[PDB]
Amino acid sequence: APAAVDWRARGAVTAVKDQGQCGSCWAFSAIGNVECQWFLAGHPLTNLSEQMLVSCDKTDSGCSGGLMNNAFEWIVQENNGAVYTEDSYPYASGEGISPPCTTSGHTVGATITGHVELPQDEAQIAAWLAVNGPVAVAVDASSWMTYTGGVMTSCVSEQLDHGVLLVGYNDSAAVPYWIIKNSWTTQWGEEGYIRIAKGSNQCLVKEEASSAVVG
Numbered sequence: 001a002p003a004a005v006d007w008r009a010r011g012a013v014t015a016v017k018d019q020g021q022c023g024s025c026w027a028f029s030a031i032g033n034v035e036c037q038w039f040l041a042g043h044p045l046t047n048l049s050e051q052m053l054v055s056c057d058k059t060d061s062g063c064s065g066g067l068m069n070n071a072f073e074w075i076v077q078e079n080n081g082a083v084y085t086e087d088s089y090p091y092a093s094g095e096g097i098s099p100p101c102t103t104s105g106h107t108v109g110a111t112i113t114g115h116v117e118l119p120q121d122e123a124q125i126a127a128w129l130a131v132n133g134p135v136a137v138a139v140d141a142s143s144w145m146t147y148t149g150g151v152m153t154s155c156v157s158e159q160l161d162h163g164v165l166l167v168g169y170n171d172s173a174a175v176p177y178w179i180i181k182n183s184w185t186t187q188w189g190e191e192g193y194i195r196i197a198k199g200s201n202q203c204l205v206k207e208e209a210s211s212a213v214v215g
């Protein structure tokens with residue numbers, strides 16, 4: 001595998017969002033993966049809607065939280081693969097309250113037909129990520145609210161609590177690292193991102209990794 005990857009530099013990744021006081025990070029993770037799998041599929045960079053997931057995906061629990069695998073599953077099964085634009089199903093859950101489901105007013109912004117579930121193996125996750133792009137990942141973010149910058153190397157890693165996006169890594173570095181999109185504003189972390197150490201299952205990042213498949 002290449003010694004370093006950052007899918008952002010190829011412009012594959014959308015602007016860093018804001019989930020609000022709402023445990024909708026599973027939605028932000030998933031949607032971010034979709035935005036990226038849809039870009040790389042030859043299509044233009046389009047902002048997609050987490051609100052669709054939060055309000056409509058009943059297989060998960062809205063502002064109370066959820067899984068990404070279920071998000072993907074639901075999109076493909078109940079929503080026939082269709083994911084709406086963000087502009088036409090905008091986020092209205094910045095206050096821990098999620099609007100009910102609406103079925104008119106929107107516009108389809110992407111298609112996925114399934115998703116894949118990655119080996120609990122950091123290196124394969126990495127290789128794959130080099131070949132196919134950004135990966136939704138579940139993580140322990142317990143030590144994260146105190147992260148200002150750098151390669152965090154002392155992660156509490158015991159229970160998975162968060163949903164974020166792997167956009168790349170680096171292996172040449174002194175401390176090898178992952179490169180991670182967060183849905184807490186760009187005013188958090190490294191302009192909305194965090195790097196953690198690659199190689200030790202920091203934050204249980206090798207655990208639940210998956211990605212929507214566009215085509």
Ligand SMILES: CN1CCN(C(=O)N[C@@H](CCCONC(=N)N)C(=O)N[C@H](/C=C/S(=O)(=O)c2ncccn2)CCc2ccccc2)CC1
Pocket residue numbers: 019020021022023024025026061063064065066067068138139141159160161162163208
């Ligand atoms: C049955 N059960 C319980 C609910 N659930 C779940 O919560 N999953 C996580 C995703 C991690 C994926 O894998 N995890 C594992 N396999 N164990 C989730 O949705 N976490 C959200 C946001 C937290 S946040 O950091 O983004 C945040 N919230 C509020 C303000 C700022 N930041 C947690 C949701 C939540 C937690 C406490 C209070 C409110 C909301 C799936 C399985």
